[model samples]
Target chain A: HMSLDLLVMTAEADATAVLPALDLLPHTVRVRAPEVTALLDAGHRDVILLDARSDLASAKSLCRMLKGTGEAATPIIAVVGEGGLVAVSAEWRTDDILLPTAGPAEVDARLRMVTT
Target chain B: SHMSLDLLVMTAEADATAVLPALDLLPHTVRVRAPEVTALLDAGHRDVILLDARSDLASAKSLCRMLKGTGEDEAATPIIAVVGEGGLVAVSAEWRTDDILLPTAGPAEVDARLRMVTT
Candidate 1:
């Protein structure tokens, strides 16, 4: 039941619209372009939710870039579709994977697990 | 070859601090996720998977069985069980893991094992 500050990186027009489950949770969520430069200006955030619904290639590169930032303690969670799950691998370096249509309880559970 | 491998470390720990410390010195890209069925969905394309078997022998055995059953495809990724010295006694061919890794293994040994398991 903790409120977390989340940074979601997506190329979608509406950041909040990317993950519908997010709307059902009590978290301070912000959207950023799917780019590595976002980290430079990303203030304090509990977890990084990367949009992998589309442009999986781009998402993988972005995920690797985030992890490759050389020294980061923050965790990265990739948001993907059912079909896209097969494409995700260890190379993504994501701490966890989130389904776009997950329930609020599942979403909140993952957040706590990833940050716990 | 000295190419970097994609290593998926399946553990409940978000930080996976219990994973091989030697992994930090290697160039492989590593991702940590819980040892659940969902994690298997993302492991289809990984080069290798490191299943956390530090303490949970029963659970680890079930996961190993599940992975073996799921690796029906010809290109299935190899699995490596991470174990402690005491855990060595419980592992068997039934686990179906290609190899086993010790948390205390050095960079060279870990890297070599990774190469061997992948090949």
Candidate 2:
């Protein structure tokens, strides 16, 4: 329903289908590699979409790196599998968590909430 | 159309405006009370328990920890905290909150949060 700059940080394989609903939406999305070094290259964005389905360790690292680097203004939403939910905590320092295959309404709702 | 949830609003503030400014905008049936264990107990059954921390963050933290620690009586239902922009830093995993919302959050955010927590 609203458009904002969304930077998706994920592995190359996940780049295509990170969040299927997101592809159908109109937000301006910029895809990038999920690496600690990638945070330095991250440009301005309204929000950061992070994938945590396979490697929670890497996802957690990327989240902490962003927050530590003073990019906390752009909230981060972690795309996690159902089981990954248990491992995500406030310690991760991300703004929120979304199921990897969330419906369009759910996806829009989260993007809407975080972007504001 | 969606059915209204039985919501229990507990806050250390004197009024809803001081803590839960966005609360009345939703159509849920709300029961208001002081953020005390006794008052929380008297509030009876509800679908969601909203802890207001815009005014008293510490009060909200203690209430959430205690209610979550109380076990089965507080099980099944999820507790969402209404916080100020500053309150986010103070909250952590230890609070055992189901979710959190800012006092300035709109209906869409509120509706989405309750949906996530309830499900």
Which one is best on DockQ?
2
Q: What is the lDDT of residue A105 in candidate 1?
A: 55
Which candidate has the highest TM-score of all?
Answer: 2
Off by over 4 Å in 2: A1-30, A33-116, B70-74
Locate the minimum summed-lDDT window of 10 residues in model 2 chain B.
Answer: B69-78
The structural similarity of chain B in model 2 to the true chain B, as TM-score, is: 0.84
For model 1, fnat equals 0.00
Question: Candidate 1, which segments miss by more than 4 Å at Cα?
Answer: B1-119
Q: Assess candidate 2 and give its lDDT.
A: 0.74
TM match of model 2 to true structure: 0.53
- TM-score on alpha carbons, each prediction: 0.50, 0.53
Error of 1 at B45 (Å): 22
For each candidate, the alpha-carbon lDDT, in order, equals: 0.78, 0.74
Model 1 C-alpha lDDT per residue in residues B70-118, reported as the tens digit of each score: 4466677888888776656567667877767667766765776677666
Candidate 2's displacement at residue A20, Å, is: 22
User: Candidate 2 on B4-119: residue-level lDDT in tens?
Assistant: 88887887556666656656787777788888888666736788888877777777788788888845453467899887665565767678777877776656456656755665
